Amino acid sequence: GIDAAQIVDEALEQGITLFVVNNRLQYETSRDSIPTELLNKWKQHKQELIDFLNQLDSEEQTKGSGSGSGSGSGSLLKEKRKHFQAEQNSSQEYLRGEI
């Protein structure tokens, strides 16, 4: 089939950072976008990564991915408030997704 470690290896060489977080696969990178080459396979083998990587996170019982996803519940009011008062562009080209 395919090894999760191999799919992740390809991500890092492409400059994309994906791993299992909260039982889901997610990617992050600000370069050009995501090359369909790996992306096409990622969605197609999403479960393969979540299944193997889930195990990998448990083998270490530490480290691995963890940050982000802090807030989730929300509405446009979040945007409307920063529209009223804010500063900086704060990472204006970061494209992310969930495999």
Side-chain angles (χ1 to χ4, degrees):
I2 209 316
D3 258 77
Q6 292 206 247
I7 322 222
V8 182
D9 217 274
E10 112 210 327
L12 307 174
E13 62 169 82
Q14 278 301 313
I16 337 302
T17 55
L18 57 57
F19 212 71
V20 147
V21 209
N22 192 214
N23 219 108
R24 83 232 275 195
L25 238 205
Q26 47 164 98
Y27 67 87
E28 175 188 274
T29 194
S30 183
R31 288 171 93 269
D32 260 327
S33 288
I34 315 299
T36 192
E37 318 204 305
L38 39 72
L39 185 107
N40 160 287
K41 143 182 74 221
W42 286 351
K43 42 234 283 71
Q44 201 159 104
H45 296 289
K46 150 258 142 176
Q47 180 200 288
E48 314 302 316
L49 271 275
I50 288 164
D51 202 75
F52 252 98
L53 297 193
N54 162 253
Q55 295 163 181
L56 267 74
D57 180 280
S58 209
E59 286 165 355
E60 299 258 70
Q61 296 178 85
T62 185
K63 315 310 158 183
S65 277
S67 318
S69 317
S71 196
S73 196
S75 322
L76 256 304
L77 69 92
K78 67 203 290 175
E79 184 177 291
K80 296 183 83 170
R81 282 175 174 180
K82 66 183 202 175
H83 191 290
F84 188 78
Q85 58 176 127
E87 61 188 87
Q88 307 305 111
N89 293 317
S90 191
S91 47
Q92 72 202 106
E93 192 160 80
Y94 275 79
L95 63 93
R96 317 112 180 306
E98 185 178 32
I99 296 314

PDB file of all heavy atoms in Angstrom, residues 25-48:
ATOM      1  N   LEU A  25      -5.990  14.504  10.057  1.00  0.00           N
ATOM      2  CA  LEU A  25      -4.783  14.881   9.352  1.00  0.00           C
ATOM      3  C   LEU A  25      -5.008  16.322   8.910  1.00  0.00           C
ATOM      4  O   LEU A  25      -6.080  16.647   8.387  1.00  0.00           O
ATOM      5  CB  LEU A  25      -4.566  14.055   8.074  1.00  0.00           C
ATOM      6  CG  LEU A  25      -3.273  13.241   7.936  1.00  0.00           C
ATOM      7  CD1 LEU A  25      -2.997  13.054   6.440  1.00  0.00           C
ATOM      8  CD2 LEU A  25      -2.043  13.884   8.574  1.00  0.00           C
ATOM      9  N   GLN A  26      -3.998  17.168   9.040  1.00  0.00           N
ATOM     10  CA  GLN A  26      -4.067  18.567   8.633  1.00  0.00           C
ATOM     11  C   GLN A  26      -2.687  18.983   8.138  1.00  0.00           C
ATOM     12  O   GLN A  26      -1.694  18.426   8.607  1.00  0.00           O
ATOM     13  CB  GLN A  26      -4.599  19.461   9.772  1.00  0.00           C
ATOM     14  CG  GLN A  26      -3.914  19.186  11.117  1.00  0.00           C
ATOM     15  CD  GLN A  26      -4.140  20.289  12.145  1.00  0.00           C
ATOM     16  OE1 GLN A  26      -5.002  20.198  13.011  1.00  0.00           O
ATOM     17  NE2 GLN A  26      -3.329  21.328  12.092  1.00  0.00           N
ATOM     18  N   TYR A  27      -2.639  19.922   7.189  1.00  0.00           N
ATOM     19  CA  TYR A  27      -1.427  20.460   6.568  1.00  0.00           C
ATOM     20  C   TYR A  27      -1.346  21.978   6.705  1.00  0.00           C
ATOM     21  O   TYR A  27      -2.379  22.640   6.816  1.00  0.00           O
ATOM     22  CB  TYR A  27      -1.371  20.083   5.076  1.00  0.00           C
ATOM     23  CG  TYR A  27      -2.427  20.699   4.170  1.00  0.00           C
ATOM     24  CD1 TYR A  27      -2.241  21.964   3.576  1.00  0.00           C
ATOM     25  CD2 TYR A  27      -3.587  19.968   3.875  1.00  0.00           C
ATOM     26  CE1 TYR A  27      -3.204  22.479   2.686  1.00  0.00           C
ATOM     27  CE2 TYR A  27      -4.531  20.454   2.959  1.00  0.00           C
ATOM     28  CZ  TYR A  27      -4.346  21.713   2.353  1.00  0.00           C
ATOM     29  OH  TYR A  27      -5.308  22.162   1.497  1.00  0.00           O
ATOM     30  N   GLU A  28      -0.131  22.530   6.646  1.00  0.00           N
ATOM     31  CA  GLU A  28       0.141  23.963   6.747  1.00  0.00           C
ATOM     32  C   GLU A  28       1.438  24.269   6.000  1.00  0.00           C
ATOM     33  O   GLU A  28       2.407  23.503   6.107  1.00  0.00           O
ATOM     34  CB  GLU A  28       0.281  24.353   8.234  1.00  0.00           C
ATOM     35  CG  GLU A  28       0.700  25.812   8.506  1.00  0.00           C
ATOM     36  CD  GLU A  28       1.018  26.072   9.988  1.00  0.00           C
ATOM     37  OE1 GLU A  28       0.096  26.376  10.780  1.00  0.00           O
ATOM     38  OE2 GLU A  28       2.204  26.015  10.396  1.00  0.00           O
ATOM     39  N   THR A  29       1.452  25.382   5.258  1.00  0.00           N
ATOM     40  CA  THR A  29       2.589  25.879   4.502  1.00  0.00           C
ATOM     41  C   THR A  29       2.251  27.213   3.845  1.00  0.00           C
ATOM     42  O   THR A  29       1.082  27.448   3.533  1.00  0.00           O
ATOM     43  CB  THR A  29       2.963  24.897   3.373  1.00  0.00           C
ATOM     44  OG1 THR A  29       4.231  25.199   2.832  1.00  0.00           O
ATOM     45  CG2 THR A  29       1.955  24.865   2.212  1.00  0.00           C
ATOM     46  N   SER A  30       3.182  28.168   3.816  1.00  0.00           N
ATOM     47  CA  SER A  30       2.911  29.384   3.066  1.00  0.00           C
ATOM     48  C   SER A  30       3.919  29.327   1.918  1.00  0.00           C
ATOM     49  O   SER A  30       5.030  29.812   2.162  1.00  0.00           O
ATOM     50  CB  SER A  30       3.098  30.611   3.972  1.00  0.00           C
ATOM     51  OG  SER A  30       2.783  31.840   3.335  1.00  0.00           O
ATOM     52  N   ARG A  31       3.717  28.602   0.796  1.00  0.00           N
ATOM     53  CA  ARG A  31       4.738  28.777  -0.250  1.00  0.00           C
ATOM     54  C   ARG A  31       4.116  29.296  -1.537  1.00  0.00           C
ATOM     55  O   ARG A  31       4.046  30.512  -1.722  1.00  0.00           O
ATOM     56  CB  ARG A  31       5.342  27.383  -0.474  1.00  0.00           C
ATOM     57  CG  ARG A  31       6.225  26.905   0.679  1.00  0.00           C
ATOM     58  CD  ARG A  31       6.599  25.436   0.465  1.00  0.00           C
ATOM     59  NE  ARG A  31       7.879  25.326  -0.243  1.00  0.00           N
ATOM     60  CZ  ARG A  31       8.117  25.247  -1.554  1.00  0.00           C
ATOM     61  NH1 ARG A  31       7.142  25.129  -2.455  1.00  0.00           N
ATOM     62  NH2 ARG A  31       9.386  25.317  -1.935  1.00  0.00           N
ATOM     63  N   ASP A  32       3.578  28.391  -2.370  1.00  0.00           N
ATOM     64  CA  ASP A  32       2.837  28.693  -3.591  1.00  0.00           C
ATOM     65  C   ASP A  32       1.372  28.295  -3.578  1.00  0.00           C
ATOM     66  O   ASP A  32       0.493  29.033  -4.026  1.00  0.00           O
ATOM     67  CB  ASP A  32       3.572  28.138  -4.825  1.00  0.00           C
ATOM     68  CG  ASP A  32       4.388  29.189  -5.584  1.00  0.00           C
ATOM     69  OD1 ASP A  32       3.988  30.374  -5.640  1.00  0.00           O
ATOM     70  OD2 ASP A  32       5.461  28.837  -6.128  1.00  0.00           O
ATOM     71  N   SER A  33       1.149  27.136  -2.943  1.00  0.00           N
ATOM     72  CA  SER A  33      -0.053  26.308  -2.743  1.00  0.00           C
ATOM     73  C   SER A  33       0.464  24.881  -2.469  1.00  0.00           C
ATOM     74  O   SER A  33       1.631  24.711  -2.095  1.00  0.00           O
ATOM     75  CB  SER A  33      -0.952  26.303  -3.996  1.00  0.00           C
ATOM     76  OG  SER A  33      -1.608  27.530  -4.195  1.00  0.00           O
ATOM     77  N   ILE A  34      -0.382  23.856  -2.616  1.00  0.00           N
ATOM     78  CA  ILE A  34      -0.017  22.460  -2.410  1.00  0.00           C
ATOM     79  C   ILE A  34       0.090  21.774  -3.777  1.00  0.00           C
ATOM     80  O   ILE A  34      -0.827  21.928  -4.592  1.00  0.00           O
ATOM     81  CB  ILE A  34      -1.078  21.717  -1.558  1.00  0.00           C
ATOM     82  CG1 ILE A  34      -1.560  22.498  -0.320  1.00  0.00           C
ATOM     83  CG2 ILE A  34      -0.535  20.346  -1.129  1.00  0.00           C
ATOM     84  CD1 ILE A  34      -0.446  22.825   0.679  1.00  0.00           C
ATOM     85  N   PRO A  35       1.169  21.037  -4.080  1.00  0.00           N
ATOM     86  CA  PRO A  35       1.287  20.319  -5.341  1.00  0.00           C
ATOM     87  C   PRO A  35       0.233  19.215  -5.361  1.00  0.00           C
ATOM     88  O   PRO A  35       0.156  18.393  -4.451  1.00  0.00           O
ATOM     89  CB  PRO A  35       2.703  19.747  -5.381  1.00  0.00           C
ATOM     90  CG  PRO A  35       3.154  19.725  -3.923  1.00  0.00           C
ATOM     91  CD  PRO A  35       2.328  20.803  -3.234  1.00  0.00           C
ATOM     92  N   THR A  36      -0.585  19.157  -6.408  1.00  0.00           N
ATOM     93  CA  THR A  36      -1.616  18.139  -6.543  1.00  0.00           C
ATOM     94  C   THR A  36      -1.027  16.736  -6.463  1.00  0.00           C
ATOM     95  O   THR A  36      -1.782  15.815  -6.181  1.00  0.00           O
ATOM     96  CB  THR A  36      -2.437  18.306  -7.828  1.00  0.00           C
ATOM     97  OG1 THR A  36      -3.597  17.492  -7.794  1.00  0.00           O
ATOM     98  CG2 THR A  36      -1.647  17.961  -9.096  1.00  0.00           C
ATOM     99  N   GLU A  37       0.254  16.552  -6.789  1.00  0.00           N
ATOM    100  CA  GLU A  37       0.899  15.243  -6.790  1.00  0.00           C
ATOM    101  C   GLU A  37       0.714  14.508  -5.469  1.00  0.00           C
ATOM    102  O   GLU A  37       0.205  13.383  -5.442  1.00  0.00           O
ATOM    103  CB  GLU A  37       2.399  15.422  -7.090  1.00  0.00           C
ATOM    104  CG  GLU A  37       2.661  16.450  -8.198  1.00  0.00           C
ATOM    105  CD  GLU A  37       3.990  16.244  -8.913  1.00  0.00           C
ATOM    106  OE1 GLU A  37       5.038  16.198  -8.235  1.00  0.00           O
ATOM    107  OE2 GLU A  37       3.968  16.294 -10.167  1.00  0.00           O
ATOM    108  N   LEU A  38       1.047  15.180  -4.369  1.00  0.00           N
ATOM    109  CA  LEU A  38       0.906  14.616  -3.047  1.00  0.00           C
ATOM    110  C   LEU A  38      -0.514  14.822  -2.559  1.00  0.00           C
ATOM    111  O   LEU A  38      -1.101  13.893  -2.012  1.00  0.00           O
ATOM    112  CB  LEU A  38       2.002  15.091  -2.076  1.00  0.00           C
ATOM    113  CG  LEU A  38       2.486  16.538  -2.128  1.00  0.00           C
ATOM    114  CD1 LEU A  38       1.431  17.497  -1.579  1.00  0.00           C
ATOM    115  CD2 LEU A  38       3.768  16.767  -1.337  1.00  0.00           C
ATOM    116  N   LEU A  39      -1.114  15.983  -2.844  1.00  0.00           N
ATOM    117  CA  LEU A  39      -2.463  16.320  -2.408  1.00  0.00           C
ATOM    118  C   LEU A  39      -3.481  15.276  -2.875  1.00  0.00           C
ATOM    119  O   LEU A  39      -4.283  14.784  -2.084  1.00  0.00           O
ATOM    120  CB  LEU A  39      -2.817  17.716  -2.922  1.00  0.00           C
ATOM    121  CG  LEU A  39      -4.171  18.228  -2.412  1.00  0.00           C
ATOM    122  CD1 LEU A  39      -4.068  19.327  -1.364  1.00  0.00           C
ATOM    123  CD2 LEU A  39      -5.058  18.676  -3.572  1.00  0.00           C
ATOM    124  N   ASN A  40      -3.440  14.916  -4.158  1.00  0.00           N
ATOM    125  CA  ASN A  40      -4.322  13.912  -4.759  1.00  0.00           C
ATOM    126  C   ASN A  40      -4.304  12.620  -3.954  1.00  0.00           C
ATOM    127  O   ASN A  40      -5.355  12.015  -3.742  1.00  0.00           O
ATOM    128  CB  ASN A  40      -3.874  13.630  -6.213  1.00  0.00           C
ATOM    129  CG  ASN A  40      -4.375  12.302  -6.788  1.00  0.00           C
ATOM    130  OD1 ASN A  40      -3.889  11.244  -6.414  1.00  0.00           O
ATOM    131  ND2 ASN A  40      -5.288  12.315  -7.740  1.00  0.00           N
ATOM    132  N   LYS A  41      -3.112  12.188  -3.553  1.00  0.00           N
ATOM    133  CA  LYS A  41      -2.913  10.979  -2.775  1.00  0.00           C
ATOM    134  C   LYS A  41      -3.312  11.193  -1.330  1.00  0.00           C
ATOM    135  O   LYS A  41      -3.873  10.278  -0.742  1.00  0.00           O
ATOM    136  CB  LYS A  41      -1.446  10.559  -2.911  1.00  0.00           C
ATOM    137  CG  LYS A  41      -0.779   9.950  -1.658  1.00  0.00           C
ATOM    138  CD  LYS A  41       0.677   9.638  -1.984  1.00  0.00           C
ATOM    139  CE  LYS A  41       1.404  10.973  -2.024  1.00  0.00           C
ATOM    140  NZ  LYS A  41       2.383  11.078  -3.122  1.00  0.00           N
ATOM    141  N   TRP A  42      -3.075  12.375  -0.763  1.00  0.00           N
ATOM    142  CA  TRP A  42      -3.392  12.659   0.625  1.00  0.00           C
ATOM    143  C   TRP A  42      -4.855  12.422   0.896  1.00  0.00           C
ATOM    144  O   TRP A  42      -5.213  11.608   1.735  1.00  0.00           O
ATOM    145  CB  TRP A  42      -3.048  14.124   0.925  1.00  0.00           C
ATOM    146  CG  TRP A  42      -1.608  14.427   1.039  1.00  0.00           C
ATOM    147  CD1 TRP A  42      -0.628  13.507   1.080  1.00  0.00           C
ATOM    148  CD2 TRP A  42      -0.962  15.719   1.207  1.00  0.00           C
ATOM    149  NE1 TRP A  42       0.562  14.145   1.275  1.00  0.00           N
ATOM    150  CE2 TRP A  42       0.421  15.496   1.434  1.00  0.00           C
ATOM    151  CE3 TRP A  42      -1.403  17.055   1.205  1.00  0.00           C
ATOM    152  CZ2 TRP A  42       1.313  16.529   1.732  1.00  0.00           C
ATOM    153  CZ3 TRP A  42      -0.532  18.109   1.528  1.00  0.00           C
ATOM    154  CH2 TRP A  42       0.822  17.840   1.801  1.00  0.00           C
ATOM    155  N   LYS A  43      -5.735  13.065   0.136  1.00  0.00           N
ATOM    156  CA  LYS A  43      -7.165  12.884   0.351  1.00  0.00           C
ATOM    157  C   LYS A  43      -7.567  11.428   0.137  1.00  0.00           C
ATOM    158  O   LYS A  43      -8.400  10.903   0.871  1.00  0.00           O
ATOM    159  CB  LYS A  43      -7.969  13.854  -0.520  1.00  0.00           C
ATOM    160  CG  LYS A  43      -7.495  14.040  -1.969  1.00  0.00           C
ATOM    161  CD  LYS A  43      -7.229  15.491  -2.383  1.00  0.00           C
ATOM    162  CE  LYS A  43      -8.499  16.298  -2.660  1.00  0.00           C
ATOM    163  NZ  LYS A  43      -9.271  16.621  -1.445  1.00  0.00           N
ATOM    164  N   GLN A  44      -6.946  10.771  -0.836  1.00  0.00           N
ATOM    165  CA  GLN A  44      -7.213   9.392  -1.184  1.00  0.00           C
ATOM    166  C   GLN A  44      -6.734   8.387  -0.133  1.00  0.00           C
ATOM    167  O   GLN A  44      -7.372   7.346   0.027  1.00  0.00           O
ATOM    168  CB  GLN A  44      -6.563   9.172  -2.552  1.00  0.00           C
ATOM    169  CG  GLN A  44      -7.110   7.987  -3.339  1.00  0.00           C
ATOM    170  CD  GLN A  44      -6.782   8.180  -4.815  1.00  0.00           C
ATOM    171  OE1 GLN A  44      -5.878   7.556  -5.363  1.00  0.00           O
ATOM    172  NE2 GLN A  44      -7.483   9.082  -5.483  1.00  0.00           N
ATOM    173  N   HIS A  45      -5.680   8.711   0.620  1.00  0.00           N
ATOM    174  CA  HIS A  45      -5.068   7.883   1.653  1.00  0.00           C
ATOM    175  C   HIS A  45      -5.072   8.601   3.011  1.00  0.00           C
ATOM    176  O   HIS A  45      -4.196   8.404   3.851  1.00  0.00           O
ATOM    177  CB  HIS A  45      -3.674   7.437   1.173  1.00  0.00           C
ATOM    178  CG  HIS A  45      -3.765   6.563  -0.056  1.00  0.00           C
ATOM    179  ND1 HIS A  45      -4.235   5.268  -0.104  1.00  0.00           N
ATOM    180  CD2 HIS A  45      -3.485   6.946  -1.338  1.00  0.00           C
ATOM    181  CE1 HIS A  45      -4.215   4.875  -1.387  1.00  0.00           C
ATOM    182  NE2 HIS A  45      -3.783   5.869  -2.181  1.00  0.00           N
ATOM    183  N   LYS A  46      -6.077   9.442   3.242  1.00  0.00           N
ATOM    184  CA  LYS A  46      -6.300  10.229   4.456  1.00  0.00           C
ATOM    185  C   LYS A  46      -6.312   9.301   5.660  1.00  0.00           C
ATOM    186  O   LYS A  46      -5.603   9.527   6.641  1.00  0.00           O
ATOM    187  CB  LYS A  46      -7.622  11.018   4.290  1.00  0.00           C
ATOM    188  CG  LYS A  46      -8.404  11.324   5.583  1.00  0.00           C
ATOM    189  CD  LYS A  46      -9.624  10.409   5.813  1.00  0.00           C
ATOM    190  CE  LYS A  46      -9.775  10.048   7.290  1.00  0.00           C
ATOM    191  NZ  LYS A  46     -10.988   9.258   7.576  1.00  0.00           N
ATOM    192  N   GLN A  47      -7.139   8.264   5.574  1.00  0.00           N
ATOM    193  CA  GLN A  47      -7.300   7.277   6.616  1.00  0.00           C
ATOM    194  C   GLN A  47      -5.975   6.577   6.894  1.00  0.00           C
ATOM    195  O   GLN A  47      -5.675   6.328   8.054  1.00  0.00           O
ATOM    196  CB  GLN A  47      -8.362   6.280   6.149  1.00  0.00           C
ATOM    197  CG  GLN A  47      -8.639   5.156   7.153  1.00  0.00           C
ATOM    198  CD  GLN A  47      -9.306   3.985   6.447  1.00  0.00           C
ATOM    199  OE1 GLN A  47     -10.469   4.048   6.069  1.00  0.00           O
ATOM    200  NE2 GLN A  47      -8.579   2.916   6.174  1.00  0.00           N
ATOM    201  N   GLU A  48      -5.188   6.271   5.860  1.00  0.00           N
ATOM    202  CA  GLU A  48      -3.912   5.577   6.017  1.00  0.00           C
ATOM    203  C   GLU A  48      -2.984   6.353   6.956  1.00  0.00           C
ATOM    204  O   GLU A  48      -2.343   5.760   7.822  1.00  0.00           O
ATOM    205  CB  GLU A  48      -3.232   5.335   4.660  1.00  0.00           C
ATOM    206  CG  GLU A  48      -4.140   4.783   3.552  1.00  0.00           C
ATOM    207  CD  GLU A  48      -4.823   3.459   3.885  1.00  0.00           C
ATOM    208  OE1 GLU A  48      -4.147   2.549   4.421  1.00  0.00           O
ATOM    209  OE2 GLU A  48      -6.016   3.339   3.523  1.00  0.00           O
TER     210      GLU A  48
END
